[PDB]
Amino acid sequence: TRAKAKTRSSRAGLQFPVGRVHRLLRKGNYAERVGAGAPVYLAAVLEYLTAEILELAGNAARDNKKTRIIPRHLQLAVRNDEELNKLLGRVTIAQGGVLPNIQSVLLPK
Amino acid sequence: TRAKAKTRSSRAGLQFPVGRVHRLLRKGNYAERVGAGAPVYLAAVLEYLTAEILELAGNAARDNKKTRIIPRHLQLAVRNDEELNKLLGRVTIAQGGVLPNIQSVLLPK
Amino acid sequence: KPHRYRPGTVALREIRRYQKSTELLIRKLPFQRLVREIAQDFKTDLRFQSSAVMALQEASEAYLVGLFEDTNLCAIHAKRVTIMPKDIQLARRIRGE
Amino acid sequence: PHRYRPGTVALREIRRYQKSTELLIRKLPFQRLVREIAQDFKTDLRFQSSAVMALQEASEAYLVGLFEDTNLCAIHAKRVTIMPKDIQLARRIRGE
Amino acid sequence: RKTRKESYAIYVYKVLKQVHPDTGISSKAMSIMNSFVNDVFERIAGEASRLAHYNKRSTITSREIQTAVRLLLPGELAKHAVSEGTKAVTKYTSAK
Amino acid sequence: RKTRKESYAIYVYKVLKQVHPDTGISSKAMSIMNSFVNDVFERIAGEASRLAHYNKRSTITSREIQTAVRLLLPGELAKHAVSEGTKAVTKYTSAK
Amino acid sequence: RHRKVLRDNIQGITKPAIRRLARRGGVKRISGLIYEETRGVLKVFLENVIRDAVTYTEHAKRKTVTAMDVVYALKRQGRTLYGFG
Amino acid sequence: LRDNIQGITKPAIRRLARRGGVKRISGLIYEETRGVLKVFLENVIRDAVTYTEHAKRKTVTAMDVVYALKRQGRTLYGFG
Amino acid sequence: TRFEDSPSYVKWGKLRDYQVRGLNWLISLYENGINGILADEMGLGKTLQTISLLGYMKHYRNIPGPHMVLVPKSTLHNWMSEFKRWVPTLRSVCLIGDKEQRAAFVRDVLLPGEWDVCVTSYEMLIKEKSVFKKFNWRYLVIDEAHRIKNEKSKLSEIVREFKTTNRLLLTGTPLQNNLHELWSLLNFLLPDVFNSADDQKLVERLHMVLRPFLLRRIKADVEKSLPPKKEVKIYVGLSKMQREWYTRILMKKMRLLNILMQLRKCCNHPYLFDGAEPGPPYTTDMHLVTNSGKMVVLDKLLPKLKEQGSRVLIFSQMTRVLDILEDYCMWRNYEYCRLDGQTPHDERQDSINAYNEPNSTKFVFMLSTRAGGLGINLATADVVILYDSDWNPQVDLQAMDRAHRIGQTKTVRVFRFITDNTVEERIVERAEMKLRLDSIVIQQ
DNA sequence: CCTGGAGAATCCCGGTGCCGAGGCCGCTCAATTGGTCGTAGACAGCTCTAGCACCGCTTAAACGCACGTACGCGCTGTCCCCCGCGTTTTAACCGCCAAGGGGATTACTCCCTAGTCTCCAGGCACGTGTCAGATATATACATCCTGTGCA
DNA sequence: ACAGGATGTATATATCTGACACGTGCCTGGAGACTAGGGAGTAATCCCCTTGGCGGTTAAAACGCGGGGGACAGCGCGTACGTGCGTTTAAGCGGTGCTAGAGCTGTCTACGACCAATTGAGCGGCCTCGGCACCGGGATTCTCCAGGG
Ligand SMILES: Nc1ncnc2c1ncn2[C@@H]1O[C@H](COP(=O)(O)OP(=O)(O)OP(=O)(O)O)[C@@H](O)[C@H]1O
């Protein structure tokens, strides 16, 4: 017959859909042929970026005395971190609000 | 037998290559299929844009008492026509210079 | 005789309060009416999904907030506290609008 | 002794350079600067002349636009001289 | 000899001789015009690909090209370009 | 019956469970993360496609994806993401 | 006879609402002539976004502007929005 | 190669300012201009060198520079 | 099985044989332990029977604890006054006012629980669901059961989540446009019985299943008083400009999102729309009537109704029309009273009650399709004028029979204006079909 | 304080030389013409979901108004900093040469990816319950502002 | 300059509820196994173009100095905005009534991919001349002191 099927995500030590990424690459009209390791690499990079964002958001939520993560925590984590701020400079996160920032000229003294 | 080959551009009465546009669209990974009329439409649009910019640049070149269009003339035309300026807002033309304007405050008493 | 906060304390309180929250500030029905009036000019007989107006409101709020941040920066540059249309025009001119 | 007022020669230079179209930075120093900066990212890199020319053109255009925005900021601040804080405000509002 | 390179130079020259019968062009201006044509082609084609993907269709058509032109070109440019393209497609359908 | 929609929600929840074990997420947060993943995927795929077109190749490969990552991600993020991608490709190639 | 129009839609957004937006931005003192300029700027921004969205809806052969159309229009303008598709 | 930022001199910066349209220049402008030029050039050269590395070459081309500038959103016409 | 003449504990109450038999029926329904619907359209009253039921429950085997009565806010003062006048032994409290007033009420009354009957409104109930959910209920009285006719409504969920041992629904319009309304009512009454939405699968089986726990007695069949009304339809035409505007609307700048709505009131009056809406308010002069054939016909028909009687109580379908005509009849050459949703309720009740007057010589009084609830009979009202018909026939029936109280001992007349080859006839035939369905369901 | 010269700076006209633009050929490669086919989309049909127009009630929010206070703005004096100009170095610019590296092309091979078929399991829609978050309410705390000796 | 009184805010506690986390069942797409083919790696060779050097030249930068104008701190003022309080209104939510339009299914056709032969359009190379750069010389205009207006 045929051997037991191991998902390519499980083979690669990832947690993202290598097969779905491969299908999206082949169906996105990006090129004609796609390499075998390209979807694996792309899924790994997506996993790293998602993990970093979720780590920062979880830290913010724990600081704010909360467990569930909300777009406010997501935006707070995205800002206050220069690398992700540069990556997501032009995007707007719905219901994320604005960072607390008052210029020192306005503060009475 | 057959007849004399008639170019698609000549059939559409265009000065731009419908066949070359069609080949570029096929070899551009834009979509798996390309309609017959799309290259003709694109060629007409490209011809119109080129004609507009060339007319403006040639008028500027004649206004400067030269019979050869140069990047300075192209820049003057593009920056003086507001629609073309909005189209080419973030485009830099080499050997183009800038529009002559001096802020009214810096003019003397 | 009655208690009176000086001119500039309540402004700071409101600034902190509104920078602490995340919700929308414009009124939903007036914003929807404005959106429909603008869409009338482009085309008549238009229907709006309820989520589209919400997205438009979110984008408008973000744009206005960012613009006001930069306008405040311009006013502070001019050694002032009150923001002005000249500041708004300068900010738009620099940002490329 | 002939001496122009302090500021008319500036206007004449402004008009002349806004009329002209050629480069303003010395080509050999700019080339050395480009090679020195590229030394950090890679060792023993070679360059085409057109690559350096395009880099110089882009740098000139960017600096001219930056100075235009800085002049607008200085004029807004009730001044005719430009300052480093004006340049910083221009950068901050442009998006850096 | 040297491998062949492709450009819109001859067609640009034809259009120039059409609009202004007695005006010439230089190599730098021709290269600038070629880059302009390439950029417009890239923008329109990419927008049309995005449109076809959004509507879940696998063909690029005149409707998609026209919609992309409306999205990209502002105002009067869009109107006149749409008129020109419609006329050209009408002539091509008639003369096929 | 409604046609199924594909979302990365389950995988993002697995990653969140690995990072912060006892921590949840909201529906709007899930939508934002899904949109973010889609946007990053689109950016990297477009960069790789343009790279392949420029080099006159027809295959998007691991080298292309690595180059796209280095072009898009800012610095230290790019370095660590490159390390992760190399490790994943090594695992997928070593004995598979 | 009692028949008249109430108020045009641009004045739908109010001076206290614009003040709240300026407070979130960080503004402490606001001039009285900021509100008309704010209304004009908002009108221009909405006109651009709505034109792009209506073009997308027209291409789709629909008559209902959708959140996806709005998101695509915003992405084309360069103001990517997360949380709607 | 060392201290070549000094090659970009005060007269050149004054000429650039005059083309921009400024009349008076502060004495501290020059260091700021050198810094902004440094960061801009660093970004562009980094992207171009990445393109050259992918192409597996040792020479940086005008096409690579144009590709980097188009990535940054500063399209250049007249070099390919 | 129960009392055959007036209960000894009623104070001055003169409830007749139908009332006493309804009381016996409700008592027996309580005995067998099932809820029920008291479908008395008019001429019988339900307030008296409900108050008598609760008074019996107090003065007999003690159950004087919590009891909830749901009424519209417009009748709360009337309900409390009637309760005090008829049966003053029980104590009644009301939940009204804003947040601080309701907090004062709950604190000083609700916690001690010195009350037997609590009377509130739907809105206050929604506001204070949490405060009211801490108390068990033994007899939940709700009037106008069509208020919960549909599911997914917040009130339906709130009233379902409530803990009521028994329930009592008061309604005069049990069926409106489909059997899923009666099914919703029956499901609310007996959730464990009418779980599923399910001529023999119709009409007759419906009658048989509704017989055990429903009461429906006609006022004419009970009292034989209240002389029947006469209903007259008038086939009115429309002006040529009205036809032209109707065409230019129907085939297609103005907004016409809801095509049926925007091509509807057209027959009522042309200038109701925008575009040709009244321009410069020159003066109140002869401009409105001449442009609409319906109001021309109304002006022609005025003198004969003016010669005698002449209390009309005209009904129109558009509030726009109601308010303009309300402020219009004064100028025309008459005196009026105004009823609208913009008039405050607390003032409204006493205002209309006082405006009930033996001699007014005012000739006009206007009520909307919705603005009129259920009360206050004008015995001087003789001719009912229906400018336009609503889709719901039960609303039209309520507007028609609000003058059919006993206070009215004269035969009453109904006038109906209908246009031709328009959607008004569509609305009329739909209403006729729904009214026939209600009649066959609740009478056969 | 408006005229009048004196002095640079600039422009306009004419003559001269050079290099890039524009025209003319060969050929080869990409575009044209003819014919076949299969699949994507056009067209028709149907269900049901959501969108539009309209009513009542509540209540937060908007609107209007009066008082006073920081704040924007105009003006003045000081001083120091930047500019204009002449002079000395300094290095860029240009022309020419020599050499080697490396970019570009061509041919050959093989290995990696497209395409197919089969099957099965991961992923999605749908219900359902319970716990984290939202809210009300009552303390404790921090902060702001103004009055009273002495600053 | 502190003391104290009046606001506001942060915090603890108790209820309640609805959205999230998990389950279940099914089904569509991903994995396993195989076959072909053409894209790309690899090697070799050519030539061009980048770099290094060197000399002569002249324009440009660096440096110093005198002086005027612009930056900046200070003062005075009138006034437009912030704060609070009372009155009105229309937003928000809950319902009514209706139907149009989106979204999925199914069939058929006509349109674009694919292939083969043919050919003329466009591209690289080549050559000549005239448009443009440069130079010179005279005419014109702008700017800045000096003082008589
Ligand atoms: N005390 C009474 N004795 C006898 N008949 C009465 C009494 N009260 C009311 N009715 C009858 O009821 C008719 C109207 O009564 P009422 O106005 O109280 O009705 P209602 O409570 O508004 O009606 P509904 O049952 O529809 O709620 C009278 O005309 C009369 O026939």
XYZ file of C-alpha atoms in Angstrom, chain C residues 69-70 73-75 77-80 86-87 90-91 93-95, chain D residues 68-69 72-74 76-79 85-86 89-90 92-94:
32
model
C -0.308 65.040 15.953
C 1.758 66.571 13.157
C 4.301 69.448 16.203
C 4.195 72.386 13.776
C 2.591 74.650 16.387
C 7.861 74.476 16.292
C 6.393 77.969 15.890
C 6.701 78.440 19.695
C 2.932 78.328 20.189
C -1.557 77.568 8.688
C -0.088 74.701 10.720
C 2.091 73.263 6.358
C 1.725 69.703 7.647
C 2.262 70.358 2.276
C 5.180 68.539 3.905
C 3.416 65.164 3.917
C 12.712 72.881 0.225
C 10.712 71.447 3.125
C 9.039 76.052 4.363
C 9.444 75.180 8.053
C 11.791 78.117 8.658
C 6.587 79.209 9.048
C 8.693 79.835 12.167
C 9.020 83.552 11.227
C 12.588 83.236 9.972
C 15.687 71.736 14.230
C 13.932 72.777 11.016
C 10.901 68.747 11.893
C 10.867 68.191 8.132
C 9.653 63.899 11.361
C 6.678 65.094 9.332
C 7.906 63.344 6.169
